[PDB]
């Protein structure tokens, strides 16, 4: 009677809540991962993400072998294959860590129900969050739609520490392997076999080992300057751990512990502040994940009533130029180029290009949300939807109407155009002054396009549409 542990976005053996809980029940612990066609074949899957995922799985296969058992690989529909696998193995139970997204939660409910019908226990525990969505509630027992109060609560809650890595596992026998032979893939498919290609690199190399190494390195040095270095795209001031957190190559308790230890080690007020600021970013992460959990309709698009009626202009040609980094706005194009070429973008840049697509181009932001999901190595529904709702204050933590001025943003966060010239080398000959203002002479512009829109006119247009709608309602 073995216990199966179903991995999804927790591709590591260390600090894994459900895995550690399973090990406490049995040493005959076998891991499994199911390549779900509804996920892998989605038009919203990003090649960079498949590449990172695949790399994480290669290491996980090794970790299980070294631990004493193995990682089973399946390809097909979870609610059909997992119960069948469990039944063929006469599994005592199937464990996994809970999801916050609509698809995963619906899927899990079905798998759990199928397992129950088969008389097999299903244990679903919280792992990817320091505090589950049901632990953080207002005085009236309700979820938060405003960040301030959420943080006040979240910050005061006792923090959990990392759990133990399972050891001394017992592998499946030949007879057990024969019983499940039909449900398994003989080996982990290569990226190319899956029909994907990616050669743009990663913010952090794939796998548990690389993630843990990055966390330690960051907390050992860079984290001390996080504030204000986190604001400048030209600087490598952030952790680059986003895909590791999205796929769980690193445990959230490990991340919190490393930062906490660095804070206790530091004797500098500035360093301590920088570390606290990084820790709060983890809080923002939970704010958006808890929001998606409590208000799943957020995934459908503009949340607030007014925004569900916004008269998006939707000029496809403008959207296309945005996707191809041909907007004529240096700060925006450099950012879009970084995204398509490397699958990652500095947060200040995500804010900048999002504001541009939504406010300047006036394109339904779901188009941008989707493009980001089709290219981000860290593409995450909760954080991505949170970022795009943010571009219009159409969801959680709404703020008064505001429109970023690309030139103002560039001058403030890329004052010497170092980031711009880095991703737009064909403009390295241009003075930072003009790259920031976005006013480049045709001769020095070469093949670089002219601005696709006039910011002042677009800003007036967006405000006019907003004010007219607000009045009509
Ligand atoms: C339009 C838009 C889309 C976004 N899309 C994503 C996305 O698909 N996936 C993703 O994980 N984040 C997204 N972000 C949030 C963000 O830009 C980062 O998580 C990312 O830049 C991570 O870089 P890092 O790992 O170096 O972050 P660090 O600065 O080192 O922060 C550490 C961790 O905190 C979390 N984090 C930081 N900023 C935020 C935030 N604003 N919201 C949620 N989590 C945050 C991430 O897990 C990150 O790895 C989006 C933001 C915007 C404005």
Tokens of 454: 């006039």
Separation between Cα atoms, residue 290 and residue 284, nearest integer Å: 10
Contact 150, 137 (CB under 8 A): no
CA 376, CA 118: separation in Å to the nearest integer? 39
Which residues, at least 6 apart from 252, have a Cβ–Cβ distance to it below 8 Å?
A: 127, 128, 129, 130, 245, 282
Which tokens is 361 given? 């181009």
69 CA from centroid of ligand 1 (Å)? 35
Compute the Cα dihedral for 279, 404, 362, 401 and give only its sign: positive
Please check whether residue 72 is in contact with residue 33, taking contact to mean a CB–CB distance below 8 angstroms. Answer: yes
Question: What spacing in Å lies between the alpha carbon of 245 and ligand 1's midpoint?
Answer: 10
| Nearest atom within ligand 1 for CA of residue 381 | 8
Q: With contact defined as beta carbons under 8 Å apart, do 438 and 386 qualify?
A: no
Cβ atoms of residues 122 and 116 within 8 Å = yes
Q: How far is the CA of 282 from the centre of ligand 1 (A)?
A: 9
Structure letter (DSSP) for residue 96 = E
Q: Is the CB of 380 under 6 A from ligand 1?
A: yes
Residue 296 DSSP code: G
Smallest Cα–Cα separation from 82: which of 4, 169, 25?
4
Is the distance from the beta carbon of residue 162 to the nearest atom of ligand 1 less than 6 Å?
Answer: no
Q: For tokens 């939707």, what's the residue?
A: 314
Question: Please, which residues bridge with residue 350 across strands?
Answer: none
Tokens representing residue 213 in the block: 């190494």
Which letter, b or e, does each residue of 135-172 get, where b requires 16 or more Cβ atoms within 10 Å of its Cβ? ebeeeeeebbbebeebbebbeeeeebebbebbeebebb
From CA 285, how far away is CA 247, in angstroms rounded? 14
Among 379, 383, 384, residue to substitute to test ligand 1 (most atoms within 8 Å of Cβ): 383
> Residue 280, Cβ neighbours under 10 Å: how many?
16
SS (H, E, C) 180-204: HHHHCCCCCCCCCCCCCCCCCCCCC
Ligand 1 pocket check for 214: Cβ under 6 Å: no
Mutate to test the pocket of ligand 1, among 129, 387, 394, 395 (most ligand atoms within 8 A of CB): 387
Catalytic residues: 281, 284, 312, 347, 365, 388
Q: Please report, for residues 275, 283, 347, 413, the alpha-carbon distance to residue 230 in angstroms, rounded to integers and kept in the order given.
A: 11, 16, 9, 10
- Name which of 435, 431, 380 is nearest 407 in CA terms: 435
Residue of 301, 302, 288 whose CA lies nearest to 382 = 288
User: Interior CA angle at 134 toward 130 and 135, to 5°?
Assistant: 55
Chain breaks in the chain (C to N over 2.5 A) after: none
Query: Phi and psi dihedrals of 73, rounded to 5?
Result: -120, 125
Within a 13 Å sphere around the CA of 244, how many CA atoms are in the beta-carbon half?
24
Task: Look at the chain and count its residues.
Answer: 473
Cis peptide before 2 (omega within 30 of 0): no
Is the Cβ–Cβ distance between 63 and 22 less than 8 Å?
no
Domains in the chain, please, with CATH? 1-127 (3.40.50.620), 128-162+208-295 (1.25.40.80), 296-471 (1.10.579.10)
By three-state DSSP, how is residue 120 classified?
Answer: coil
Contact 332, 406 (CB under 8 A): yes
CA of 280 to the centre of ligand 1 (A): 12
- Quote the ligand 1 centre to 388 CA distance (angstroms): 12
β-pairing, 29-35 vs 71-75, is: parallel
154, 247, 347: which to mutate for ligand 1, most atoms within 8 A of CB? 347
What atom of ligand 1 comes closest to residue 218's alpha carbon?
30
Cβ proximity of 282 and 130 under 8 Å: yes
For residue 29, the cross-strand partners are 3
Euclidean distance between CA atoms 9 and 53, whole angstroms: 9
Run of H or E including 29: strand 29-35
Q: How many helices (H) and strands (E) does the chain have?
A: 22, 5
């Amino acid at each position: 009677a073995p216990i199966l542990f179903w991995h999804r976005r927790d591709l590591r053996l260390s600090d894994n809540i459900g895995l550690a809980a399973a090990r406490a029940q049995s040493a005959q612990l076998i891991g499994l991962f199911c390549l779900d066609p509804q996920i892998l074949q989605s038009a919203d899957m990003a090649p960079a993400r498949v590449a990172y995922l695949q790399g994480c799985l290669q290491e996980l296969q090794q970790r299980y072998q070294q631990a004493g058992s193995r990682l089973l690989l399946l390809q097909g529909d979870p609610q059909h294959l997992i119960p069948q696998l469990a039944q063929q193995l006469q599994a005592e139970a199937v464990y996994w860590n809970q999801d916050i997204e609509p698809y995963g939660r619906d899927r899990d409910g079905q798998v759990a129900a199928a397992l129950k019908t088969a008389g097999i226990r299903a244990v679903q525990l919280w792992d990817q969050l320091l505090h589950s969505p049901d632990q953080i509630l207002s005085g009236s027992g309700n979820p938060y739609s405003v960040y301030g109060p959420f943080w006040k609560n979240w910050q005061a809650q006792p923090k959990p520490t990392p759990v133990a890595t399972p050891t001394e596992l017992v592998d499946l026998s030949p007879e057990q392997l024969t019983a499940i032979a039909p449900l398994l893939l003989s080996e982990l498919p290569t990226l190319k076999q899956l029909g994907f290609d990616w050669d743009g690199g990663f913010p952090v190399e794939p796998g548990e080992t690389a993630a843990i190494a990055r966390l330690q390195e960051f907390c050992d040095r860079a984290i001390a300057d996080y504030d204000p270095q986190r604001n400048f795209p030209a600087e490598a001031g952030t952790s680059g751990l986003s895909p590791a957190l999205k796929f769980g190559a690193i445990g959230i308790r490990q991340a919190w512990q490393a930062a906490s230890a660095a804070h206790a080690l530091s004797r500098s007020d500035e360093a301590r502040n920088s570390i606290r600021v990084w820790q709060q970013e983890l809080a923002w992460r939970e704010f958006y994940q808890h929001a998606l959990y409590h208000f799943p309709s957020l995934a459908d698009g503009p949340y607030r009533s007014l925004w569900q009626q916004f008269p998006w202009e939707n000029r496809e040609a403008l959207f296309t130029a945005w996707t191809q980094a041909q907007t004529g706005y240096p700060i925006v194009d450099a950012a879009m180029r970084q995204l398509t070429e490397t699958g990652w973008m500095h947060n200040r840049c995500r804010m900048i290009v999002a504001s541009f697509l939504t406010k300047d181009l006036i394109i339904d932001w779901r188009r941008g949300e989707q493009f980001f999901m089709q290219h981000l190595v860290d593409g995450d529904l909760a954080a991505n939807n949170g970022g795009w709702q943010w571009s219009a204050s159409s969801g959680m933590d709404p703020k008064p109407l505001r429109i970023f001025n690309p030139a103002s943003q560039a001058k403030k966060f890329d004052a010497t155009a170092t980031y711009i010239k880095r991703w737009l080398p064909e403009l390295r000959h241009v003075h930072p002054k003009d790259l920031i203002s976005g006013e480049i002479t045709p001769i020095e512009r070469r093949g670089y396009p002219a601005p696709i829109v006039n910011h002042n006119l677009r800003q007036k247009q967006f405000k006019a549409l907003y004010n007219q709608l607000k009045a009509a309602i």
